[PDB]
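Blackboard transcription, Thursday session:
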Amino acid sequence: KAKLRASHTWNPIQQMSINVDNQFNYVPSNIGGMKIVYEKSQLAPRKLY
Amino acid sequence: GVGISTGTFNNQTEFKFLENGWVEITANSSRLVHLNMPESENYRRVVVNNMDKTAVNGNMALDDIHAQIVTPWSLVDANAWGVWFNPGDWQLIVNTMSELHLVSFEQEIFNVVLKTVSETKVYNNDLTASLMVALDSNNTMPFTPAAMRSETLGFYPWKPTIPTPWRYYFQWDRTLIPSHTGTSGTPTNIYHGTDPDDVQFYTIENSVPVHLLRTGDEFATGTFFFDCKPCRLTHTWQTNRALGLPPFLNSLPQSEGATNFGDIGVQQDKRRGVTQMGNTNYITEATIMRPAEVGYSAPYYSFEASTQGPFKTPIAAGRADGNPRYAFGRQHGQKTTTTGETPERFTYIAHQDTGRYPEGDWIQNINFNLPVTNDNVLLPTDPIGGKTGINYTNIFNTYGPLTALNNVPPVYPNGQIWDKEFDTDLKPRLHVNAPFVCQNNCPGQLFVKVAPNLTNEYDPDASANMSRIVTYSDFWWKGKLVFKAKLRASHTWNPIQQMSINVDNQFNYVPSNIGGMKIVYEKSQLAPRKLY
Amino acid sequence: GVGISTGTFNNQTEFKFLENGWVEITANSSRLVHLNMPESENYRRVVVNNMDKTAVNGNMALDDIHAQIVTPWSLVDANAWGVWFNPGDWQLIVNTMSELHLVSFEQEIFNVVLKTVSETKVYNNDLTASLMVALDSNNTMPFTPAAMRSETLGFYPWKPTIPTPWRYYFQWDRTLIPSHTGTSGTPTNIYHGTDPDDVQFYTIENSVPVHLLRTGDEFATGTFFFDCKPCRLTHTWQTNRALGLPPFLNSLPQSEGATNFGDIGVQQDKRRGVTQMGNTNYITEATIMRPAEVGYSAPYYSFEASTQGPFKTPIAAGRADGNPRYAFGRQHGQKTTTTTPERFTYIAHQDTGRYPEGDWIQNINFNLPVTNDNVLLPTDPIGGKTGINYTNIFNTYGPLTALNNVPPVYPNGQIWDKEFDTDLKPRLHVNAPFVCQNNCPGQLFVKVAPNLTNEYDPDASANMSRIVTYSDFWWKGKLVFKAKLRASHTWNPIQQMSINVDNQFNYVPSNIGGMKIVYEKSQLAPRKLY
Amino acid sequence: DPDDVQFYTIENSVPVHLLRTGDEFATGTFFFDCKPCRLTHTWQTNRALG
Amino acid sequence: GVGISTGTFNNQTEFKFLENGWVEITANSSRLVHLNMPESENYRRVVVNN
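(Written on the board underneath:)
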């Protein structure tokens, strides 16, 4: 059970995204080679005080 | 009462969630609008003619001939994405939604301050004169979206704004024969005035009931509920080559790496399939039958002439032709502390991936002898009409019944939201300049003017312009634009492209040390969609 | 009473006002119809082949080669504007109405009388033989509108009329390779024949029930009910240049005068706006983005060939090409007391046209004072032929095109037309303002029955011996329209149609009783596109 | 290009039934809404109209 | 179970005639489908380049 976020601030926040570097980590090779690479979990900033 | 306030400032973009994955996005917005009195109180027909620039041969595209009624009314136009959503809100919208309906739109004006100036300068509040406001609910006046000229309300809530002074096109007739530099004689370049069958001269005064607001009263625009179709925040990557079942690869690779390609194991002329080519045995990925045509070629940089002068043909989707280019000022994205009259510009290179690459076309004979000879193929390098630059793709149209197209994407912050459907008996299928096309009616324009503060001496008999006490207005506008939006789902193993802050774009989204700010353009259709 | 009328003659136009500015217009119309008996009683498969005129090199466009089934029947076709309105009511309609709906329609036949000739010529009545009447209610028969040939019923209420001898096309196959004057030899120009899969021979007797009317009875139609979309009696003037917000001027004119033009203050590369040109910084009225395209270029005077020979490509709009030209006779508006057709070309106010001599395409690089090699003008020979420029082969129809339905043409214009029974249907028909959504009213077919002699036998190869016979009958129809009254949104007046000093003598008859109906514009008032 | 990558897998996208020798799988009745396909052809070129 | 059949082969075409000149064509079809195991159990990404 999870809550959805809200855009509290003017600026955008960091988000996970496929780009030209990590593209082939998420699709199989030409002889069936797959892999799973680590993803960060706590991207968005939060106000502590 | 003068001393009692009449509203509340609001810019909160509320996100109210619903069952079945729908979200009611509620973009409140409000601005301070500064209005001076008109330069002249009279409607004035004006004709522009840059004959000096246009008469030079080869400068045909610089034709700026037009006739217009310069009007003593200012337009308050909130039809632009930057007026409503901030960069964080647009990040949330593009990354998490999938579709985006237009639901409702209303406005109001409150806290009207009216001021007069006397000579050093001394400012005094005027508690007697009033602001004139008019709402064209029936859309009797000509429709004039300010987004195309970059004169909507400013995007920063914390900076005052100004409304654009309204004007609209008269009729005119003009012909301009085209000519290249070094032609043998001056081409026909003349203005024929205006024909009497097409004359129209509208006025705010006789078209719309005008409301008068002193410093102590409000005006509220009622809710207008749209009928618009869903705008889609996902893009299609499939051209014609990637529709249907791929060919079966008999011999797959046996070692890793890019250099180890698979191979189809069957000779070209002994393959099995359907080809729409009735005199050849070759089944190839180019020749194989597909359901229909994704995208279409069009004559790029083609100008056609009509009664009112020459204009460019619009292309629905581009690859550079077709890709729109937006030029705009400090209110609408450029850095507020930059010095100079040069607008900042970008070209919106869309992800929609439907357009054509015109350097890769060719046409060849019906006989289809395979290693084609020079006489039997027309390449994009061959002249047309002896012109080495203008090859055949500049003339070539392939719009047909089998064409499929996507609507134009949103362009944040300068793009349009809604645009009125034409009055023709036959509609255009899409509009190149807005994602939504309001069909039956489309929200009423709000025109504003400072009422004439006449001097103690006045005579209608005089030929000179009426003398008025110098006067300007500051009024607070508020509007609320409601959207319904569907949240996306993860249909694939891989993650999708998502907007993110990074080290490169980090300083566009926070203010500079001297308080400057900018709003950098922003891709809308990020996630891929399955066309088939 | 046999000698007393079975119905009442009527031509009076009835206007009735409904709520909210709606109005109902009942165009009552009645005509006397004269009908001679058929030249032959049999259907004939006639083939036309003007090889003599076509065979000369360069007369490709003069191909009349076709086949048709010449029937013993005749058609009563009231599908034209002049049949239902006189100049006064059309003037009032086009000056006071903004929209026009086609609502309902009915016919009847009354006061039928049948006569025969004896031999000087002595004319006799025959109350025993019958007129043959049939209405194709189910639209089984081919739809053959007579307005295209100008063979509808006469527009004058008081003169007699005659119905068109009815015929329909029969499938043929033909090739005509084009040639120019000076081609090296005779081109291929032959008539193949007809194909077995496409043969279609209809007959009135087998398809529709035929009523055998005699004097003292009538045929009347149940009123047909249209559902067509409204035609609009107001033209739109705005091309793409006059769409959207104009630019603001930093220098308004300081004094009145024709030569005192206003001026934009900003340099063309330094302006603000949106242009659909990724690699060009100049913002101009030609280059600025517009919501869509108004009108479209199409290849003009282009002829395309299929199985049944070459034909001209129709164009939905025009600026001399594109605009329709009519050629009509005495029954349909020619000056009656004159002894060639009379002609006009409808230069309508609809606009949405193109001016081919002003178009050009230039290279994508857009070196702005464009050199010769980087622009293709309408002066350049395509294919080496100096008369054919690029606009002859140029099509700009696309997803962004917006067009207006064709004007009505008074008095010779057709009112309605039959929607094609293809799967994908055209957006408009270029020969009628209304298109029947599912069915049009049935075609009314008439014929005088065989008045045989005592000498008739079937085995004789000669045509059957028939007594000389004709018939005279009165046709009536009632067409109901519905329309919206216009409103004066605009300050200045509109171009209303009115009698002036030049055109005054066209409305009144001559001293010898002649008359004419001149052509009248339809979409007079202007209208917003936006 | 990374913005167009789409890797679909049958395991992650649909429920998968296991059938041993002795059981069935019955897809429910799917109902169409397609337009009528016509088993007749139109000979009339432009020249044959009117 | 193992030895109890779970369906009936059928390839009849049944023409049921309704009123007002309509015919409901019930096209049945049945095939014995042979299936080998996959060549390799991994999803593969293969480029053809001639």
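Lecturer's comment: Residues 8 and 46 of chain A are 10 Å apart (CA to CA).
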